Design an enzyme around this catalytic site. Structure first.
Site, PDB file in Angstrom:
ATOM      1  N   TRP A 165     -10.077   1.894   8.583  1.00 50.41           N
ATOM      2  CA  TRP A 165      -8.826   1.865   9.361  1.00 50.41           C
ATOM      3  C   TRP A 165      -8.984   2.675  10.656  1.00 50.41           C
ATOM      4  O   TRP A 165      -7.994   3.035  11.309  1.00 50.41           O
ATOM      5  CB  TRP A 165      -7.640   2.391   8.527  1.00 50.41           C
ATOM      6  N   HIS A 211       3.313   8.668  -1.962  1.00 51.61           N
ATOM      7  CA  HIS A 211       2.745   8.431  -0.639  1.00 51.61           C
ATOM      8  C   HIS A 211       3.812   7.944   0.351  1.00 51.61           C
ATOM      9  O   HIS A 211       3.789   8.344   1.515  1.00 51.61           O
ATOM     10  CB  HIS A 211       1.626   7.379  -0.744  1.00 51.61           C
ATOM     11  N   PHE A 231      -5.794  -5.840   2.009  1.00 51.94           N
ATOM     12  CA  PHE A 231      -6.131  -4.422   1.804  1.00 51.94           C
ATOM     13  C   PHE A 231      -6.259  -4.052   0.313  1.00 51.94           C
ATOM     14  O   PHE A 231      -6.644  -2.924  -0.019  1.00 51.94           O
ATOM     15  CB  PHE A 231      -5.163  -3.526   2.571  1.00 51.94           C
ATOM     16  N   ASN A 256     -11.244  -3.939  -2.401  1.00 53.57           N
ATOM     17  CA  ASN A 256     -12.033  -2.853  -1.884  1.00 53.57           C
ATOM     18  C   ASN A 256     -13.240  -2.632  -2.794  1.00 53.57           C
ATOM     19  O   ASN A 256     -13.883  -1.566  -2.675  1.00 53.57           O
ATOM     20  CB  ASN A 256     -11.200  -1.565  -1.780  1.00 53.57           C
ATOM     21  N   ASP A 291      -1.497   2.465  -4.362  1.00 53.94           N
ATOM     22  CA  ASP A 291      -1.886   1.250  -3.610  1.00 53.94           C
ATOM     23  C   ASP A 291      -2.485   0.204  -4.566  1.00 53.94           C
ATOM     24  O   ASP A 291      -3.700   0.206  -4.841  1.00 53.94           O
ATOM     25  CB  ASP A 291      -2.916   1.769  -2.599  1.00 53.94           C
ATOM     26  N   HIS A 329      -9.733   1.211 -10.980  1.00 52.59           N
ATOM     27  CA  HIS A 329      -8.367   0.758 -11.416  1.00 52.59           C
ATOM     28  C   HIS A 329      -8.494  -0.137 -12.649  1.00 52.59           C
ATOM     29  O   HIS A 329      -9.523  -0.783 -12.821  1.00 52.59           O
ATOM     30  CB  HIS A 329      -7.694  -0.098 -10.340  1.00 52.59           C
ATOM     31  N   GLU A 387     -12.874  10.463  -2.796  1.00 58.25           N
ATOM     32  CA  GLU A 387     -13.060   9.060  -2.344  1.00 58.25           C
ATOM     33  C   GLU A 387     -13.972   9.073  -1.123  1.00 58.25           C
ATOM     34  O   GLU A 387     -13.716   9.852  -0.194  1.00 58.25           O
ATOM     35  CB  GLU A 387     -11.739   8.397  -1.957  1.00 58.25           C
ATOM     36  N   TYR A 388     -15.019   8.248  -1.100  1.00 52.92           N
ATOM     37  CA  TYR A 388     -15.780   8.122   0.140  1.00 52.92           C
ATOM     38  C   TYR A 388     -16.339   6.702   0.224  1.00 52.92           C
ATOM     39  O   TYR A 388     -16.266   5.976  -0.747  1.00 52.92           O
ATOM     40  CB  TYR A 388     -16.859   9.203   0.264  1.00 52.92           C
ATOM     41  N   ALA A 389     -16.831   6.313   1.392  1.00 50.68           N
ATOM     42  CA  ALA A 389     -17.544   5.049   1.565  1.00 50.68           C
ATOM     43  C   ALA A 389     -16.663   3.853   1.159  1.00 50.68           C
ATOM     44  O   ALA A 389     -16.944   3.229   0.162  1.00 50.68           O
ATOM     45  CB  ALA A 389     -18.833   5.075   0.762  1.00 50.68           C
ATOM     46  N   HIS A 390     -15.642   3.511   1.933  1.00 48.49           N
ATOM     47  CA  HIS A 390     -14.669   2.486   1.584  1.00 48.49           C
ATOM     48  C   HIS A 390     -15.336   1.106   1.477  1.00 48.49           C
ATOM     49  O   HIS A 390     -15.780   0.551   2.476  1.00 48.49           O
ATOM     50  CB  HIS A 390     -13.553   2.500   2.647  1.00 48.49           C
ATOM     51  N   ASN A 415       0.846  -1.188   0.000  1.00 45.75           N
ATOM     52  CA  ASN A 415       0.000   0.000   0.000  1.00 45.75           C
ATOM     53  C   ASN A 415       0.894   1.254   0.000  1.00 45.75           C
ATOM     54  O   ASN A 415       1.003   1.934  -1.013  1.00 45.75           O
ATOM     55  CB  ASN A 415      -0.993  -0.020   1.171  1.00 45.75           C
ATOM     56  N   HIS A 457      -5.050   5.750 -10.379  1.00 47.20           N
ATOM     57  CA  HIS A 457      -4.652   7.160 -10.278  1.00 47.20           C
ATOM     58  C   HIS A 457      -3.637   7.413 -11.404  1.00 47.20           C
ATOM     59  O   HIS A 457      -2.455   7.602 -11.117  1.00 47.20           O
ATOM     60  CB  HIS A 457      -4.014   7.455  -8.895  1.00 47.20           C
ATOM     61  N   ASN A 509       4.144  -6.958   2.601  1.00 43.19           N
ATOM     62  CA  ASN A 509       2.950  -6.849   1.775  1.00 43.19           C
ATOM     63  C   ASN A 509       1.810  -6.333   2.651  1.00 43.19           C
ATOM     64  O   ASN A 509       1.940  -6.319   3.857  1.00 43.19           O
ATOM     65  CB  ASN A 509       2.599  -8.185   1.109  1.00 43.19           C
ATOM     66  N   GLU A 565      -2.234  11.909  -3.284  1.00 46.15           N
ATOM     67  CA  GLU A 565      -1.409  11.627  -2.071  1.00 46.15           C
ATOM     68  C   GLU A 565       0.071  11.963  -2.305  1.00 46.15           C
ATOM     69  O   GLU A 565       0.935  11.070  -2.276  1.00 46.15           O
ATOM     70  CB  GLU A 565      -1.600  10.182  -1.585  1.00 46.15           C
ATOM     71  N   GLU A 601       2.174   9.861  -7.652  1.00 41.19           N
ATOM     72  CA  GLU A 601       1.840   9.573  -6.264  1.00 41.19           C
ATOM     73  C   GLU A 601       3.136   9.248  -5.519  1.00 41.19           C
ATOM     74  O   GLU A 601       3.817   8.334  -5.915  1.00 41.19           O
ATOM     75  CB  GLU A 601       0.838   8.403  -6.132  1.00 41.19           C
TER      76      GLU A 601
HETATM   77  O1  LIG Z   1      -7.898   1.596   0.077  1.00 40.04           O
HETATM   78  C1  LIG Z   1      -7.547   2.823   0.687  1.00 40.04           C
HETATM   79  C2  LIG Z   1      -7.522   3.969  -0.331  1.00 40.04           C
HETATM   80  N1  LIG Z   1      -7.194   5.220   0.375  1.00 40.04           N
HETATM   81  C3  LIG Z   1      -6.905   6.373  -0.503  1.00 40.04           C
HETATM   82  C4  LIG Z   1      -6.060   6.120  -1.762  1.00 40.04           C
HETATM   83  O2  LIG Z   1      -6.164   7.204  -2.686  1.00 40.04           O
HETATM   84  C5  LIG Z   1      -6.505   4.865  -2.478  1.00 40.04           C
HETATM   85  O3  LIG Z   1      -5.551   4.651  -3.511  1.00 40.04           O
HETATM   86  C6  LIG Z   1      -6.546   3.677  -1.499  1.00 40.04           C
HETATM   87  O4  LIG Z   1      -5.229   3.448  -1.003  1.00 40.04           O
HETATM   88 MG   LIG Z   2      -1.650   5.705  -1.472  1.00 31.69          MG
END
Ligand SMILES: OC[C@H]1NC[C@H](O)[C@@H](O)[C@H]1O
Ligand SMILES: [Mg+2]
Ligand SMILES: OC[C@H]1NC[C@H](O)[C@@H](O)[C@H]1O
Ligand SMILES: [Mg+2]
Lengths: 1015, 599
Positions: free
Chosen positions: A991, A410, A593, A596, A193, A349, A529-532, A94, A383, A589, A453, A408
């Site tokens: 999380w 991150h 995760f 999703n 991720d 993705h 991004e919302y509602a995982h 991730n 992304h 790893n 990110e 990215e």
């Molecule tokens: O699955 C968590 C989610 N959080 C935010 C990130 O932008 C996504 O790529 C992913 O890592």
């Molecule tokens: Mg990330």
């Protein structure tokens, strides 16, 4: 010379000899071919069988490989990822980079793929014109040789790289050699991720152009105040030798009808003190009453651009699809064609469980149909830029696209270490500028994104301003650095909650309603991004949709995310199973995760997908008396393919029915009066259900497609009839060990030491394998486990609090077990205390009343200590002895539903095979619950009450101990869990604790009752 | 390998192995030395006699030259331009590029200067720490070798290039070799109206730093409403191994009196979700009734930055001069320290009639005295960053400086052909970002400029925004593209008249009084060039000064220009005479158009 420079460890070299970026070209030599979008003879695909060898580093490649084929190379299909053919492991990580963080260096052990192709070039291609090779995507960096001679170098995995081959090709046989590195300094910018894979994973082509050619063209559309007149502005640029006789024509077609046309010689207007562009020309075409493009009605025109001589000999043509639409931010709202958008979006993705990151037409079309059938109108390219065909299909079917730069970082500490450093500004600028130059003509792209990110650095503000200046027609968004920096036109938080603040230092996540109104704030808010959707999730989804509809400046968001990124492995017998991080020996790893999605990797739906469909519907309904008000949430179309079906039912039994055509303008209302509804004699609750059906097929749906629905309670008649007095009296027998009750052929036995019902007999057939006992726990869901990084444990997660408090280990102690004969019944009274190291967690007091009719009434009262973490459920479980084929119930269904995810479910009589009452999540958990249930039938048993249940062949203990669904084995008999009360599932994120206080079991005292009888 | 890559014909390669840009460093090992600005033992000059040979192209240089000295090389003084010693002609051209316009290619006949030096390094320099070489300016591109081994490559003639030499030096005798090209793809960005010359024309130094070192520091000053209280904010960054015992102290001195002081361990505040910078620290120092810097009264303080251990052993010190002043645009006016400026400015080129483009302290001081004696308060660096000593002298004597990026593409058709093209955005960004990183601490610099005469392209708007974000304390100006685009905080026309309009297509020059009041316009107006002083000139000068005093938003301008760019030739009797374009057999050329000065 190549291993001497090491261009892959140098952020200042992103390419050598690569040609400029441009919109997609086919170089037609005939205008009719260009107009109808037929295949071009000048564009040749090199997809197919190539030779391939793998090496552990670039220094291990033999020199001979440049000249001719290696004997130990294999034949492989291009495009592909080499990890999918078994040359090394795919890595799922991730946040942590899959290499040592030492920018810009990469490890010396840098796996290397050597590809090669032998091909024929036609003699006419070498006499005149330019020949170029195009790689649509190579991961992560590569050198290219043709006939032994070095051609060039490229980086950035997600955009095309093109090289001129005119000086390298010969007549007859040619050989290309491509050396691909897994890691490069470009890898520091690609920390998304997702599975980390490599190779030539998008198409490879040759393109033949004439020496005097169209080198770029841009299309723009400007409107009057009411969208009744448009101007199409086309800018065309050429390369090669300028002559007086050259001309450009742009024509615009709607189907077979030419609608507009313009011609001109080369020569721009004066730009500055030195003159203008001699090699450019702008045409302006007027269009009256243009048909406007939107996701609801995707009207397209065809623009053909011809380069020709004054006498009318065609040199080459190019073409694209054009949509007339205007995107803008006005007074804090994002408008399309003058109306405020409501984004029903998802993040997607590019993932395939067999082919890895290789995308094909068939899978793209399957995704778009499923998205539109579930009421999505928008997709976020998470992304990176997509395969070029993706944008064409979103133009034709109608989805809004957010197009995102491949940046990215991150895993850096802090997150902006590279994006605030001017030495990485060159590398970042190539990723943004080349994306805009490729995609700026597609009508479906409505917003540009700067990446994901990467914190907030000065390189972001510079690139934000670059786009606003070259393309003023689309807003720019960027989430990094706290979601509301100077690099974004839209506030675009990730996982902000509806009502609750999350006040983190430097980058707080305000609740979305509060964010809109911070002093000074004027932008619209769309969640990127919302509602995982991880596992059994989307609890609380309805609360976002209620806010989005009430507040004008909340304009929706993109769910995380479309499809689970799982891969296929084979067992010993060759049976396929779904794998996640760690299953390939990849280390470190991040485990499950990577999964999703709303759909499984094979495109089968999770139960949460129906919840999304219902909250995102385009018709809203209200009931007042006998009247339904229907409100349209379309902005542009009239409801011309819609009819309303209504039904009135009494505890499952149909009573009345009907249909009405819908005739409702965009944003308008219709009042539908219902007939005089029947008054039934019998007891029970009446239910009214409406559904909107599309009677005709569309490009994206079958005839009969259900697009919207809603259910209400009407009149209830309470039951005032006392049960019929039976003549038989149940008989009680007392031993030291047991209470036994007999009535006819039926027998119940209660164990006097444990204090539970331990066995039941119908005839001489035992009915139970495990006693009927209280249950307070569930096999934890991903949202309960609360982990995003495998190395980091949160002691606030529900599962940590439940293990620490001893809910999984708690032992029942008997306080009281007594039996009494009444006039017409036997009454058993029990009490138990659940304890862990001295502390009492729960107490349960129960009565069982067995009467002459055979029915066993169970009454339960539970007390929960106020300082124990709230329990996951309050109910009973047992293992029944028999396995039956069907389950029949009266209650919410037919799919899995939970107290915070039950708005999509409808009350009715449902009947499914046992296998449909289990949801096969790849990481096993609690699953298959049905709420609001009044009656459950399974084999000879019937349960009545007001309860939630699940029924399956797997115990809660088995689901908790097993990491993969393929390792579950069906137990003897059937496990039944019957709950009076069940906690929500959460999923604002996965999380941190995400269950809202109204779905926690915090009352302290609980009551419920069941009847168990034999139907 | 070097003539195989041809890095000088490739706008995507502007350097190889060059270290990051930073403010000027001397690496003192004693705080008192740093405070009083005494010479540092760790900073050694390599100016003096070098060996030099000239070649018509880079392919004509013998391989042996890397190993050892050529017999036919001469001894020459560095810094110098090689045209001033008679190896080829200086070229004077205004607009037309002095080469065929075929970007990014340059001619194969590309005159090449090979310089070399033999020098001794002390044994203590090789035991511990980092040794770097610094070229303050080389025109136009070069490769560097040390002891036969290739070190790196640089472009941009007007900013320092630094390379790490720790792995290449040996005890005893060392040899540097530098191959300098006259033309490169960097030449497309350097089309200023001036003599085109080449060579190693600014100083060459060695600098010794410890392995754990100060790698950058920035100084900023914030004020209350009436300038009676200030906060000095210093940000310091380090390189090398982080330890718990490291500390940074910043002290502020006024003459001999310490006025403020602060100490801290490394570790920034949280910046985002991943944490903060472990290798950075910010000190805030309060100062009551600070003496304010201006061109009228140039009050300076001395800031000393020490890297030391918790027990108090000094590792290294760095220092700069600090002036307290605030520059801002408020309600259409440019204010210094709360008052509206009136700019009495001139444009100045770095030019010497004997030494060409080589500047020395004595000539800089002579210019500044004459400027102030004639009532000038401001100078525009036309059109490139100056020699680093220039900014120090403007801090001490009091002149406002406009500091300008080395970007001019006047000879392109149209003028924005390169600056509107994303493939040249890397090359242009190096020219702006490295200038801001070198000069951001000088109080005399009050305005940044994006370059000169390059039309208006999207690369300009991006770089404008980059500066506003890394340095919010100074306005940005840019004249190209009609003088009032979105890349400028100030309307800055060149040669607009007081009362008369000049209505050219696309880029009109309104009269200055009319420009202020165009519908929507709110910025102040300062002419970046006015009153062309060519020969017997400056008629009508009084009419500008009458307007500047009557209108509040007309805040002055920069005359074109300070000094005539003429060169000295000798006749048969050895009598010197002043020469202009065409007098060296240079062709085509623009004749007397190089002489535009007040002196
Ligand atoms: O699955 C968590 C989610 N959080 C935010 C990130 O932008 C996504 O790529 C992913 O890592
Ligand atoms: Mg990330
Ligand atoms: O001497 C004319 C003058 N015009 C404007 C330019 O900026 C200056 O460099 C100079 O060429
Ligand atoms: Mg000029």
């Amino acid at each position: 010379v190549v291993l001497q420079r090491r261009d892959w460890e140098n952020p200042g070299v992103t390419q050598l000899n690569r040609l400029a970026a441009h919109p997609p070209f086919a170089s037609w030599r005939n205008s009719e071919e260009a107009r109808t979008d037929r295949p071009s003879q000048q564009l040749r695909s090199l997809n197919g069988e190539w030779r391939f060898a793998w090496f552990p580093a670039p220094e291990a490649v033999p020199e001979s490989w440049l000249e001719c084929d290696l004997p130990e190379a294999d034949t492989v299909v291009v495009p592909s990822n080499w990890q999918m053919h078994g040359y090394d492991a795919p890595i799922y990580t991730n946040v942590t980079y899959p290499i040592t963080v030492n920018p810009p260096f990469v490890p010396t052990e840098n796996p290397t793929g050597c590809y090669s192709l032998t091909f024929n070039v036609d003699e006419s291609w070498l006499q005149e014109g330019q020949t170029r090779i195009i790689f649509d995507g190579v991961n992560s960096a590569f050198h290219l040789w043709c006939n032994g001679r070095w051609v060039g170098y490229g980086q950035d995995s997600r955009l095309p790289s093109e090289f001129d081959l005119s000086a390298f090709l010969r007549a007859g046989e040619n050989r290309l050699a491509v050396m691909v590195l897994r890691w490069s300094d470009g890898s520091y910018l690609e920390d998304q991720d997702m599975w980390r894979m490599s190779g030539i994973f998008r198409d490879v082509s040759l393109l033949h152009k004439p020496t005097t050619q169209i080198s770029d063209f841009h299309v723009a559309t400007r409107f009057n105040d009411d969208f009744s007149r448009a101007v199409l502005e086309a800018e065309v640029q050429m390369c090669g030798e300028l002559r007086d006789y050259l001309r450009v024509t742009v024509s615009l077609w709607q189907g077979e009808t030419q609608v507009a046309s313009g011609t001109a010689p080369f020569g721009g207007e004066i730009i500055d003190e030195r003159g203008g562009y001699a090699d450019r020309v702008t045409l302006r075409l007027n269009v009256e009453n243009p048909k406007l493009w939107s996701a609801e009605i995707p009207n397209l025109y065809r623009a053909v651009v011809e380069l020709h001589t004054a006498d009318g000999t065609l040199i080459e043509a190019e073409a694209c699809d054009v949509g007339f639409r205007e995107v803008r931010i006005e007074n804090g709202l994002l408008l399309l064609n003058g109306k405020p958008l409501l984004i029903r979006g998802v993040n997607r993705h590019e993932h395939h469980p067999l082919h890895g990151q290789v995308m094909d037409e068939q899978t793209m079309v399957q995704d778009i149909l499923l998205m539109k059938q579930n009421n999505f109108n928008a997709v976020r390219c998470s992304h990176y830029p997509n395969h070029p065909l993706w944008y064409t299909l979103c133009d034709r079917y109608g989805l809004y696209v957010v197009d995102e730069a491949n940046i990215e970082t991150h895993g850096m500490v802090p997150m902006n270490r590279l994006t605030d450093d001017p030495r990485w500004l060159p590398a970042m600028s190539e990723r943004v500028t080349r994306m805009v130059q490729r995609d700026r003509n597609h009508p479906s792209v409505i917003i540009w994104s700067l990446g994901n990110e990467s914190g907030h650095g000065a390189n972001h503000d510079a690139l934000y301003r670059w786009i606003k200046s070259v393309d003023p027609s689309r807003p720019v968004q960027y989430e990094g650095g706290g979601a509301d920096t100077t690099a974004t036109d839209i506030i675009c938080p990730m996982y902000a909650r509806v009502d609750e603040d999350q006040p983190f230092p430097a980058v707080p996540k305000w609740s979305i309603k509060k964010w809109l109104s911070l002093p000074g704030e004027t932008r619209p808010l769309i969640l990127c991004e919302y509602a995982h959707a991880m596992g059994n999730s989307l609890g609380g989804f309805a609360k976002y949709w209620q806010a989005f509809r009430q507040y004008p400046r909340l304009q929706g968001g993109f769910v995380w995310d479309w499809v689970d990124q799982s891969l296929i492995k084979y067992d010993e017998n060759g049976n396929p199973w779904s794998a996640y991080g760690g299953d390939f020996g990849d280390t470190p790893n991040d485990r499950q995760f990577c999964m999703n999605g709303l759909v499984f990797a094979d495109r089968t739906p999770h139960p949460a997908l129906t919840e999304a469909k219902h909250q995102q519907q385009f018709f809203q309904f209200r009931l007042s008396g006998q009247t339904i008000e229907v409100t349209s949430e379309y902005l542009f179309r009239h409801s011309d393919n819609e009819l309303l079906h209504w039904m009135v039912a009494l505890d499952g039994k149909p009573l009345a029915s009907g249909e009405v055509p819908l005739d409702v303008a965009p944003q308008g209302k219709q009042l539908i009066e219902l007939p005089e509804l029947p008054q039934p004699e019998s007891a029970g609750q009446l239910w009214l259900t409406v559904r909107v059906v599309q009677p005709n097929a569309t490009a994206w749906s079958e005839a009969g497609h259900i697009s919207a629905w809603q259910q209400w309670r009407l009149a209830e008649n309470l039951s005032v009839t006392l049960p019929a007095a039976s003549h038989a009296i149940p008989h009680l027998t007392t031993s030291e060990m047991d209470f036994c009750i007999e009535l006819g052929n039926k027998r119940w036995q209660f164990n006097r030491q444990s204090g539970f019902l331990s066995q039941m007999w119908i005839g001489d057939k035992k009915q139970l394998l495990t006693p009927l006992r209280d249950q307070f726990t569930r096999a934890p869901l991903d949202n309960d486990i609360g982990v995003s990084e495998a190395t980091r444990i949160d002691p606030n997660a529900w599962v940590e609090r439940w293990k620490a408090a001893g809910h999984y280990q708690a032992e029942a102690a008997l306080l009281q077990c007594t039996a009494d004969t009444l006039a017409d019944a036997v009454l058993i009274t029990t009490a138990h205390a659940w304890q862990h190291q001295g502390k009492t967690l729960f107490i349960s007091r129960k009565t069982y009343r067995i009467d002459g009719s055979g029915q066993m009434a169970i009454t339960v009262d539970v007390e929960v200590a106020s300082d124990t973490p709230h329990p996951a459920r309050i109910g009973l479980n047992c293992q029944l002895a028999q396995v039956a084929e069907r389950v029949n119930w009266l209650g919410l269904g037919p799919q899995e539903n939970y107290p915070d995810r039950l708005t999509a479910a409808c009350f009715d009589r449902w009947d499914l095979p046992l296998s449909d009452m289990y949801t096969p999540y790849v990481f096993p958990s609690e699953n298959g619950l049905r709420c609001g249930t009044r009656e459950l039938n399974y084999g000879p048993h019937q349960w009545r009450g007001d309860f939630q249940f699940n029924i399956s062949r797997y115990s809660q203990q088995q689901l908790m101990e097993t990491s993969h669904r393929h390792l579950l084995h069906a137990e003897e008999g059937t496990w039944l869990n019957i709950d009076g009360f069940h906690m929500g599932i959460g999923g604002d994120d996965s999380w941190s604790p995400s269950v809202s206080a109204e779905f926690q079991l915090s009352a302290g005292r609980y009551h419920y009752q069941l009847v168990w009888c034999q139907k």
